[PDB]
Amino acid sequence: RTFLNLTKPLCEVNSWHILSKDNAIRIGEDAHILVTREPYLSCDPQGCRMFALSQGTTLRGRHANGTIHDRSPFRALISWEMGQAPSPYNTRVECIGWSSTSCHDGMSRMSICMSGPNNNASAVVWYGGRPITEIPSWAGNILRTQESECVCHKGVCPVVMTDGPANNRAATKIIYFKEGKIQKIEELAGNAQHIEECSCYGAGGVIKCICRDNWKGANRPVITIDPEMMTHTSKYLCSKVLTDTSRPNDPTNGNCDAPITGGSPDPGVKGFAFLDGENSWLGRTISKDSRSGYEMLKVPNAETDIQSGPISNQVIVNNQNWSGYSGAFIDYWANKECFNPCFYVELIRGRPKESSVLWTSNSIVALCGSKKRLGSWSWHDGAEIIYFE
Amino acid sequence: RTFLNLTKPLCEVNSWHILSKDNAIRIGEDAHILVTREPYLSCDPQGCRMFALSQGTTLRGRHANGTIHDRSPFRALISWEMGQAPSPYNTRVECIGWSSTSCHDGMSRMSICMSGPNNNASAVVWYGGRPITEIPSWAGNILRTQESECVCHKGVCPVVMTDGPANNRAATKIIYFKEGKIQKIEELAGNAQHIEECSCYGAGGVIKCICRDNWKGANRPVITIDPEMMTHTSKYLCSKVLTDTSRPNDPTNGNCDAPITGGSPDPGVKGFAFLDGENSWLGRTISKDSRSGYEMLKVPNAETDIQSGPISNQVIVNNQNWSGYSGAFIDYWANKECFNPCFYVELIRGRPKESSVLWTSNSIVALCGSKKRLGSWSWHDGAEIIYFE
Amino acid sequence: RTFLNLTKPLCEVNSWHILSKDNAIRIGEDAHILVTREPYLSCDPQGCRMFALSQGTTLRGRHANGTIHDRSPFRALISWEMGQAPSPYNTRVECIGWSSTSCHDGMSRMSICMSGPNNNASAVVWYGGRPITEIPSWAGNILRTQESECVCHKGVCPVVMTDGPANNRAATKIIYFKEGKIQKIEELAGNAQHIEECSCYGAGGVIKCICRDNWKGANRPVITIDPEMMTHTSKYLCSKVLTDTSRPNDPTNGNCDAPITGGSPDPGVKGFAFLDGENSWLGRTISKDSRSGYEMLKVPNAETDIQSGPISNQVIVNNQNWSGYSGAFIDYWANKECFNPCFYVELIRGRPKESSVLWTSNSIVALCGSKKRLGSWSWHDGAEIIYFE
Amino acid sequence: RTFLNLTKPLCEVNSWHILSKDNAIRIGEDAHILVTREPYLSCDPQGCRMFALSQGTTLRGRHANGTIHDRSPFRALISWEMGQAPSPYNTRVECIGWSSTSCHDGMSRMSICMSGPNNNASAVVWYGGRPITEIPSWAGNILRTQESECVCHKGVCPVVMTDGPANNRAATKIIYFKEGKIQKIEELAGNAQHIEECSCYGAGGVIKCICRDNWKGANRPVITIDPEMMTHTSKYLCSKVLTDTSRPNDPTNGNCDAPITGGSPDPGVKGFAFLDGENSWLGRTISKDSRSGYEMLKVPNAETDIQSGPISNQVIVNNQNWSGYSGAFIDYWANKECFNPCFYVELIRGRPKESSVLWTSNSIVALCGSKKRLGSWSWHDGAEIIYFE
Numbered sequence A, B, C, D: 001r002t003f004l005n006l007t008k009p010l011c012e013v014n015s016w017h018i019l020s021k022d023n024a025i026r027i028g029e030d031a032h033i034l035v036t037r038e039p040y041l042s043c044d045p046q047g048c049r050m051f052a053l054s055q056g057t058t059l060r061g062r063h064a065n066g067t068i069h070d071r072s073p074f075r076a077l078i079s080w081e082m083g084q085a086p087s088p089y090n091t092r093v094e095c096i097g098w099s100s101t102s103c104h105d106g107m108s109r110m111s112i113c114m115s116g117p118n119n120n121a122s123a124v125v126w127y128g129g130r131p132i133t134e135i136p137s138w139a140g141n142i143l144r145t146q147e148s149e150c151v152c153h154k155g156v157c158p159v160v161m162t163d164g165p166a167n168n169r170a171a172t173k174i175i176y177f178k179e180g181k182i183q184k185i186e187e188l189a190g191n192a193q194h195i196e197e198c199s200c201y202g203a204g205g206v207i208k209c210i211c212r213d214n215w216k217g218a219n220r221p222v223i224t225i226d227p228e229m230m231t232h233t234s235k236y237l238c239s240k241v242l243t244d245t246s247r248p249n250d251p252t253n254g255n256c257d258a259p260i261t262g263g264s265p266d267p268g269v270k271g272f273a274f275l276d277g278e279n280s281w282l283g284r285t286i287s288k289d290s291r292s293g294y295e296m297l298k299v300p301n302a303e304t305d306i307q308s309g310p311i312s313n314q315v316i317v318n319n320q321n322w323s324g325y326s327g328a329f330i331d332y333w334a335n336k337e338c339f340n341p342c343f344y345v346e347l348i349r350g351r352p353k354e355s356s357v358l359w360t361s362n363s364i365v366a367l368c369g370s371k372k373r374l375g376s377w378s379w380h381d382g383a384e385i386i387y388f389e
Ligand SMILES: *[C@@H]1O[C@H](CO)[C@@H](O[C@@H]2O[C@H](CO)[C@@H](O[C@@H]3O[C@H](CO[C@H]4O[C@H](CO)[C@@H](O)[C@H](O)[C@@H]4O)[C@@H](O)[C@H](O[C@H]4O[C@H](CO)[C@@H](O)[C@H](O)[C@@H]4O[C@H]4O[C@H](CO)[C@@H](O)[C@H](O)[C@@H]4O)[C@@H]3O)[C@H](O)[C@H]2NC(C)=O)[C@H](O)[C@H]1NC(C)=O
Pocket: B014, B015, B016, B297, B309, B310, B311, B312, B313, B314, B373, B374, B375, B376, C119, C120
């Protein structure tokens, strides 16, 4: 084994093929399946695994009552074999807490969890299954991180974190790790005005993080990171195709260097994009208002062109079904000439959209790029809420 | 580890001994057992595994309701240790979809799943647990495959696929894979008029696939494949002993080169045969109308002689019990000078034949050849439907 | 790895220490635990495992109804990590059937299961997890074997099998296996008049099997096997201390060469003994009539002296609790200069003795020798039958 | 690959970070989770595991009724992957009994369990999964041991055991093991007047065991062990900060060489401390009467200074929540220059404090030292007792 180096370009992508689906809510109606939210996937030289924040209870259990609540001492980052649903029997605890990221550097896995009260949270950084570093809150307001995978290059794994208000200017930092140890800490610089829940991927020696501006923008901030120099720049996705939720109608032109505001009633959702000239794809909920549906839009030069619009689309989840967070990952250890973009959509079931149940949970679907023009259908959660009533 | 070569002849078979039985429906009455159908077994250097298409629900779960339906976004190919029943806790997801095949080449396992809507399905081809190739539907009508194992020789694994009507001429192809990559594609040639759900095995450098003509024939198509030249020929099993379901009474003579028009009310069922001159064995349901019972018939020269009839028989499942699909596999890595034929029978329970329950599932029984003359009994599913009422 | 040989002597035993207990019935009252009976343990270079014949249903499942019945197509030999209870999720299917034995030769494990109808049963012999040999019934009346571990010496593993009446003269054979292949078959020789369910162990290059005479004797047959010459002799335990169930009161003298009759209402139970001159121990149920209680008695020269009586005792299961079958095993791979005797007791719950439930199952306790004088208590099953009503 | 040597010093500790939490009671309200008590953690070269004494029943099972009872034939030491909750499906049985210790010497794991009746208990000492040695009771009154990990140096692992009354003078021994074999036995010497349930850790070639005086002292006894010379001394923690439960108010001065008595109604609880001059931390329940709350107190020179008081505190469990036993462990195989203190708190639920249920069980939280000043949260058992009514 050797350190992963981000030497390869992104693969050409013309459509998206099915990678995995865990059907967790369908199965968890009867089997012992943990309540989760904030899922993702991350790979290593041996393959890929699903990750999520457990609520420390099963879905049918009486303790599922109240799991709309985001932060508790009963949450933990868990991982499991891709495709399986998360049970108490097949899940690995990565760290304890209510916000996370994880990535493999080619040698071992780094996992990070924040826990604690809102005014006094702390991150614990784990490497190869052991705790290495702890980081106290710097702003006394919910120190928190990506909720999808980090990316490593020559053993250096940058991680984006935020501490401060969700609805105003906050203190975002990029922390550069190696074997779980802090190499360098940078304050956020550039034109992004607020940063949450970054979705990051690497290609051609550059890491790109596509994030959530919870304060103003319905356009997504983009942080571009040089993992060798350990420096970064930031701005917004230039395209007029707005990809946060809630958002207004797409304007005539986007804005590379400032938020495009508007939309109702919610300030943001975790999301992602792959940005590679003509080979650029933006995910978004189909609804401009709610976390419903999910579509992939091929928008050439989305990163640079304020007039860029879609040239193709693929519906991943139809607009009659619930979605949620979405994020980027790549199997960097695949036997391929290029790094092939993948993504997941979190399929939220229960509260607040479905208030006939006392709980909130999700299932997962994941897809990767194809150079072919593949047919598509909706990969919605598939559980019947009435069965849980 | 090296590539498997089909260098051995088939073992002499006089009797069939019990290999495995999972008793999934009996166990699943109380334990967390996934709803399945279209099962099979496939082996590798280390041992043998059971495979099936999950319905993404447990048997006692409320989502078992409606599982008569063949195609949904909640289906997946799953595999598990031979003999165990399939639960959410002991199963590996091989790929996502509603039609599959899988085989080990001696180095790693190739698995293929079709998914998507009827008019726009796609295959994803996996190797060593990673996605390698995607294949779009070529005829826009349920792109689909074997529902039992493929077979490999010197790294080349041919797979039979069909796209188009189930009740008319369709577009069948033989696709030759190596490490999940397409080496060659041939259109079906020869005298077989319709091809579904091929059951395939190898011996003496030749692969034979015994299939289901869903259009006209109650006699089964036979495809003979040279995996070195990557060429094939096709025709029908010659024997008067007709092996599809439904079928009419066995005629005075079979027909090597044309379908013999069937019985009532089913157009076909997946089945298999081992064809080796005198050492030839044909499986079929005992009922000529329906998926009930299962028998093995030794029919010397079934492949070449229209007058060939049985010289011995073994009842596998009595005709008072439900059967289903059946298929071939071989433990190619056994410590034996010959390749010993094995088969499974899918034991279907619930709908449509048992409509007092809302679900359709199955269990599995598997047997392999013996040179001895062994006694037999019926290996029926064994669950009491009344318990599920 | 190397083939095990049996050159070492038996360790001195002055009392018995607890090795394992699975509490299967206690746990299975509310967890998914398989119905079993006929358990045992067997070891290999890595450790020891528990074995039993599953009934192919959970204990709380509706299919547990009727599990008094000994033989069905839904039974299989399952193994699992010592001390765990047997669930559908942690058990390995060794083979399919309703009578078994198993042993490790130092290189791989051999497992044998009989299945089929009473008049036409057959054994399948597995080695290293693959089927090797099949053996048809020779007398047409429930071909059957030890229900505890066999024993191997320099690759040769003898197994005692019986085919014929349970209540009169039957056809017993010793079959000598190597790598699952038949080396030699011998008809039973000597003065034992009937043989069932042998409990076997090795020491000093010799295998002793202590069996059950179901026809006449309340004293136990003893078969002495030389695994190098592949020959055997047979007689009865000489001691006046009678160890089958049912049995009469112990007489003033035993009989080395004929069955001692008497006892009511049961013709026999599987049991065991370790016979090593002054270092000899006999197990038996505490009740003379019924399968209740269990005691270990140190009976110097039990194998050779008709007047031999106990010089020490250890109650293993008190006489207010149900026992069942018992048998011998040894960890032949321990880091010791001698082979230390171990045994298990099957703790039967449910029918026929506990008729308030519809099922029959068991749990397991296992103990090994100590040279120390250890205190003792009763290791009964521990479940409350009322909880299952 | 090598025997652990206790060469490294203790790391500097300024606050405590979360390591693991299993949330067993919350999860076990619906999933199949074993009833336990007396938990701990122990690590090896590969990772850390949770340990506890099972009660041989699940929490929702009818057999959970009466599990306040400490000693039965149905208890066993089980271990499982750190962070998971203990189920019948993911737990390894280490040994059978109702008092235990375990530790890894760098090569293999030693586990010890006591079992049997009060007047005649015995220990069985296991090494690398096999039984090695048995020790009969020397005082005929509940032979018993640490209930948390032992510590090894150059293959020698000392273990503190007690036999005799809980409420008067008893017979304590230190037994030095290597590969599970007794190297030396010492009678307790020094000023400690009664010893129970030692919590032990090593640093700089010295092992320090912080114990429970159940006879007199509310201050904790401290046994100091030289694992090379295999010798020891004993006394009490000097600090006026009393750390047993029940205890009186902290006096003006502690006493290094004799018990500080008082407190009501209970004579003791298992506890721990790390003692390293200025770098010294004492755990205790927040309540001086009952097993509620848990606090860590930095008490410089607690081991040597009768006037030493706290200079910092961290609430681990709030005083509105139930706690229980606590103990020391260290990941001796961490990639760090110093050994980092860790500890766990047992979070007892059910009887006798919560008598609305018929059972007694626990969950686990574990924390390790940080050199940082981290914020803190209460890590209580998050279950709602009403859900179990
Ligand atoms: C314990 O298990 C054993 C295995 O050792 C099992 O063996 C089986 O026994 C039966 C006979 O009992 C064998 O049955 C034979 O099967 C063939 C083929 O049958 C299929 O096809 C025919 C035609 O379509 C169907 O009617 C039939 O239902 C099957 O689907 C038949 O051709 C055989 O018929 C001949 O033998 C009969 C006597 O056995 C005659 O009565 C009959 O007239 C036929 O005779 C002619 O051929 C004989 C040569 O086989 C010859 O001896 C005669 O002189 C004459 O020319 C027959 O029905 C079956 O193959 C065996 N299976 C295996 C795997 O070995 C035992 O029966 C069972 N024992 C028990 C229960 O105690």
